[PDB]
């Protein structure tokens, strides 16, 4: 019986989590930091212990993981950062609010995007204020032309998340290490989907809470032995 | 030059405030030590430094210094490797005692010997020591061979267990082109500085590295310093 914990970062700055933050490396707001502190406290109260930590390369996630580790006094744990856990890449929508998206592209198209699993938003073009910021960012310089996305469908995000899960995270769990994952809504979606074998429509319907420990209890083949349980009051 | 290496030594801890012996006790920074790290990182920033990998102990005063630096420079994404081999020197049974308690229990002679010596360890930390479970039983050294877990350390011991990590794990990455940043402790950094500079036991013991100040090394292809360490920061500091 293995124990796996997910945490999803809370609010980022400038209201960006309602502006398709995506691959833009927004920091937490003071609120989102607070949220992460609460998740840490929860974990501390419950006496949890971990042996390895996995996170994305985006600082809203990393800073949540740091807050948690501090709260529970395991700042000495090994930490592995992978872009494969990055937030979904929203391409040209990244930065816009709901109204600006509708203005730019129309409510029919937005609805189609909001409802599709396989259909990407329009790519981030050079005239986008985040194009160089993200695509020429030092931290992705090792990614081949095909790996570095200009935009992703939920299918795409999950596709590039799972290979890291399988190849890195699964081995450690099998070796009995107690994993903690701090990441973002859509990458955690992909993990959960492969876990609970959910349908496309089902996963699009799932919306994981922020800054809250999500506890999974697993059997010897990594299937959950019961539904996901949360942590707090 | 070919390569660039940067070290940083963490600053004031909670127990420095109490002037207790920390060693492998996992004390946090004081507010002032944290602020120090913020200044170290603001310096690194102003200079424009970039890194590819970072190294540090498994003691939170190093780790938090590292974190603070990475925040100030906007490289929180970097890979980070933690190792006990970078830990502060283990002070054995002196752990938790302050200057007064050390002197009262051991006398001027003994403490002077321990201070001015390179390979005389302090007393072992025995199982009845108030911090023995706290440290020796801490689950973070579980993968340690019985011969690796010190009860106490000379400065020699400390360097002896530090240098294996340097040689085997940091050197490769430097020669790979990876700009390294090391966040650790006075004595482990002493070991690294000693190797880099070929210093005598005398000179190394006389050397006292500043806290929270980036220490830069410019290195040729053989990891030989090409000039004396530099301190980063505004003119005064
Ligand atoms: O320079 C000094 O360190 C010193 C000294 O040489 C002599 C006296 C002294 C005067 C009067 C009386 Cl009655 C008793 C002792 C006090 C001193 N300072 S100390 O803070 O206590 C201290 C002593 C030893 C270590 C030490 C331990 C283990 C490994 C390495 C270093 C660290 C701090
Ligand atoms: Cl880290």
For chain B, the domain total comes to 1
Query: Cα dist. B198→A6, A31, A124, B83, B224 in Å?
Result: 48, 51, 53, 24, 9
Residue B140 to residue A78, Cβ atoms within 8 A:
no
Cβ-based contacts of B139 with chain A (< 8 Å) = 49
Ion ligand 2 — residues with CB < 5 Å: A 79; B 80
Q: Is B103 in the pocket of ligand 1 (CB under 6 A)?
A: yes
Both tokens of residue B89?
A: 């020197």
The residue of chain B nearest to residue A56, with distances taken between CA atoms, is B77
Instruction: Give the residues across from A111 on adjacent strands.
Output: none
Residues 6+ away with beta carbon under 8 Å from A197: none
Dihedral, B52, A129, B43, B196 alpha carbons, nearest 10? 10
What's the CA gap between A154 and A200, in Å, rounded?
A: 9
What's the CA gap between A57 and B79, in Å, rounded?
A: 9
Residue-range definition of the domain harbouring residue A91: 1-233
Residues 6+ away with beta carbon under 8 Å from A232: A38, A42, A212, A213
The residue of chain A nearest to residue B50, with distances taken between CA atoms, is A138
Q: Is B27 helix (H, G, I), strand (E, B) or coil?
A: coil
Cβ-based contacts of A62 with chain B (< 8 Å) = 76-77
Q: How many other CB atoms are there within 10 angstroms of residue B92's CB atom?
A: 22
Residue B77 to residue A59, Cβ atoms within 8 A:
yes
Residues 6+ away with beta carbon under 8 Å from B172: none
Smallest CA-to-CA distance from A53 within A78, A74, A87 is with: A78
What's the CA gap between B80 and B181, in Å, rounded?
A: 10
Residues 6+ away with beta carbon under 8 Å from B36: B11, B12, B29, B211, B212
Q: Is B111 in the pocket of ligand 1 (CB under 6 A)?
A: yes
Among B100, B115, B153, residue to substitute to test ligand 1 (most atoms within 8 Å of Cβ): B115
Cβ-based contacts of B87 with chain A (< 8 Å) = none
Residue B67 to residue A66, Cβ atoms within 8 A:
yes
Q: Is A180 helix (H, G, I), strand (E, B) or coil?
A: strand
Where residue B186 sits, what CATH number does that domain have?
A: 3.40.50.1240
Q: What ligand is nearest to the CA atom of residue B93?
A: 1
What's the CA gap between A106 and A95, in Å, rounded?
A: 17
Query: A82, A164 in Cβ contact below 8 A?
Result: yes
Query: A216, A186 in Cβ contact below 8 A?
Result: no
Biggest CA–CA distance in chain A, Å, is 51
Chosen for mutation from B76, B134, B184 (greatest number of chain A CBs closer than 10 Å) is: B76
Atom of ligand 1 nearest to the CA of B122: 28
Q: How far is the CA of B116 from the centre of ligand 1 (A)?
A: 9
Question: DSSP assignment of A41-72, as one string?
Answer: HHHHHTT---SEEEE-SSHHHHHHHHHHHHHH
Question: Atom 6, ligand 1: which residue's CA is nearest?
Answer: B112
Burial grade of B196 (CB within 10 A; 0-12, 13-18, 19 or more): middle
Tell whether B222 is in a known binding site. Answer: no
Burial annotation B113-142 (CB, 10 A radius, 16+ → b, else e): ebeeeeeebbbebeeebebbeebbeeeebe
Query: B57, B84 in Cβ contact below 8 A?
Result: yes
Q: How far is the CA of A203 from the centre of ligand 2 (A)?
A: 30
What's the CA gap between A82 and B138, in Å, rounded?
A: 29
Residues 6+ away with beta carbon under 8 Å from B116: B205
How many angstroms separate the CA of residue B80 from the nearest CA in chain A?
7
Smallest CA-to-CA distance from B162 within B194, B139, B132, B140 is with: B194
The pairing of strands A179-183 and A52-55 is: parallel
Burial grade of B171 (CB within 10 A; 0-12, 13-18, 19 or more): middle
The pairing of strands B215-219 and B230-231 is: antiparallel
Query: Cα dist. A78→A7, B140, B196 in Å?
Result: 17, 11, 27
Is B10 known to be catalytic? yes
Which residues from B are below 8 Å from A when comparing CB atoms?
26, 50, 58-60, 63-64, 67, 76-82, 139-140
Smallest CA-to-CA distance from A177 within A87, A80, A82, A86 is with: A80
What's the CA gap between B16 and A229, in Å, rounded?
A: 43
Cβ-based contacts of B64 with chain A (< 8 Å) = 75
């Amino acid at each position: 019986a293995y124990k796996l914990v997910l945490i999803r970062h809370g609010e980022s700055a400038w209201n960006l989590e309602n502006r398709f933050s995506g691959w833009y490396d927004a920091d937490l707001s003071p609120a989102g930091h607070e949220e992460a502190k609460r998740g840490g406290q929860a974990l501390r109260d419950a006496g949890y212990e971990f042996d390895i930590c996995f996170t994305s390369v985006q600082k809203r996630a990393i800073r949540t993981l740091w807050t948690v580790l501090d709260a529970i006094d395991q700042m000495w744990l090994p930490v592995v950062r992978t872009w494969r856990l990055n937030e979904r890449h929203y391409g040209g929508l990244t930065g816009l609010n709901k109204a600006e998206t509708a203005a730019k592209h129309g409510e029919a198209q937005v609805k189609i995007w909001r409802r599709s699993y396989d259909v990407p938003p329009p790519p981030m073009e050079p005239d986008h204020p985040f194009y160089s910021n993200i695509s020429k960012d030092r931290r992705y310089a090792d990614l081949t032309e095909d790996q570095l996305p200009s935009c992703e469908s939920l299918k795409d995000t999950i596709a590039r998340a799972l290979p890291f899960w399988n190849e890195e995270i699964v081995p450690q769990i099998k070796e009995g290490k107690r994993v903690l994952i701090a990441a973002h809504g859509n990458s955690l979606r992909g993990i959960v989907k492969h876990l609970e074998g959910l349908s496309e429509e089902a996963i699009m319907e799932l919306n994981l809470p922020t800054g809250i420990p999500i506890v999974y209890e697993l059997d010897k083949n990594l299937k959950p032995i019961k539904p996901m349980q949360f942590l707090g009051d």
